[PDB]
Design a protein around this ligand. Sequence first.
Ligand SMILES: N=C(N)NCCCC[C@H](N)C(=O)O
Ligand SMILES: O=C(O)CCC(=O)C(=O)O
Ligand SMILES: [Fe+2]
Length: 338
Amino acid sequence: VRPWSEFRLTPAEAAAAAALAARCAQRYDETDGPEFLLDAPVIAHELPRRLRTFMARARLDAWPHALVVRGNPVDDAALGSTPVHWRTARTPGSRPLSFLLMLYAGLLGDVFGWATQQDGRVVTDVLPIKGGEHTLVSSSSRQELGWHTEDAFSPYRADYVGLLSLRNPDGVATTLAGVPLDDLDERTLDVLFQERFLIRPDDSHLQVNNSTAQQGRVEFEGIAQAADRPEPVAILTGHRAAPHLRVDGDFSAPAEGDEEAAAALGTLRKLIDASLYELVLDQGDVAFIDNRRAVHGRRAFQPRYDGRDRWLKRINITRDLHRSRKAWAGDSRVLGQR
Ligand SMILES: N=C(N)NCCCC[C@H](N)C(=O)O
Ligand SMILES: O=C(O)CCC(=O)C(=O)O
Ligand SMILES: [Fe+2]
C-alpha cells in the first residue's frame, strides 16, 4: 500500500502541462502578480483532463496524507545552477516550473504567502544555505528538519503545502506522519483534543530570515505576540475517528504546569517518531501535503554547495482565503497580523 495518493503523467500529458506553464510565463510578468494569482485557477482548467480528474477526486478521499504527481520533465542545463540563497532564486530557468506549481495548486485551492516569510512571496524556495546547516528552517541540511504542521502557530495555516522538486540528485527524503490513531489510547486522545498546549511561530517568521526593507514590517509584531504570549490550543480537532492535527516537534509545549497535557504530548512525540516514513521527491515530482492530516519534515543531508544542490519550489494553499481575512494586508495574498 501507499499512505499518499499518486498520479504519474504520461510524457504527452507532462509535455502539455509544461507547454501551458511556458505560455503563462510568456504572458504574465510574475507568478505572484495580482493578475496571475486571479487567472491561474481558471487557466488550470486547460491542464490534461486525467490530471484534473485525479486532483478533483483525490482531494475528496478520506485517507491520503498527500497528493503526489510524478513525471514533469526538468532540463538541468536549462534550469541552471541552484541559487545560493532564496533572495536570488527566481532564476529564468526555474520560472516556467514556478508557473507550473501555481497552476497545479489552483486546482486544489487559494494560494497565499506570509509577509514575514521570504519577503511575502507566494512561490517560495527550499534550498540549502551555506552557514545555515543546523537551523530550524527549510534551508537547513546537516540537521534534520523535524516533523511539523506548517505554520502550526497560526489559525490561518495552509490546508495543503505544495512542493515541486526542481532537483534532488541524491534522493533526499521528505518525511511524513499521520495521526497515530492505531496507538493513541482514549485518555491520551481526550487530552490532545483539549486546549492545553502552546504552539509558537517557527524561525522562518523572524526578521533575521527576511530581506532588509521597509515593507511587511508591521506583520512581525503579530509573530512576536504569538511567541511571547501563546494562547492555549488543542493539538487534535474534529472527528475522533479521523482527527486533524496541529503540532510542531520543536515548537510545541504543554500549557505551563499542565503535566497531563505534557504526558499526552510526550506520548504523541514518541508515536509520531516511530511511524514517520519517507517520500522521495525526485526531479519533477510534485507533492501536495495535507497539512491537517499529516506532519512533514526533511531528512538530514550533506549539502554540496557546487551548484547542483537539492532545490524545491514551495507554496501555501487554503481551501478558503476568507478564513484569514483578519490577516489580509489589503487586496494582496500576503498574510500577517498586528
Ligand atoms: N520543526 C521545525 N523546524 N519547524 C519549522 C519548519 C520551518 C518551515 C518553514 N516554512 C521554513 O520554510 O523554514
Ligand atoms: O525539504 C522538504 O522536503 C520539505 C521542507 C519543508 O518542510 C518546508 O519547506 O516547509
Ligand atoms: Fe514544512
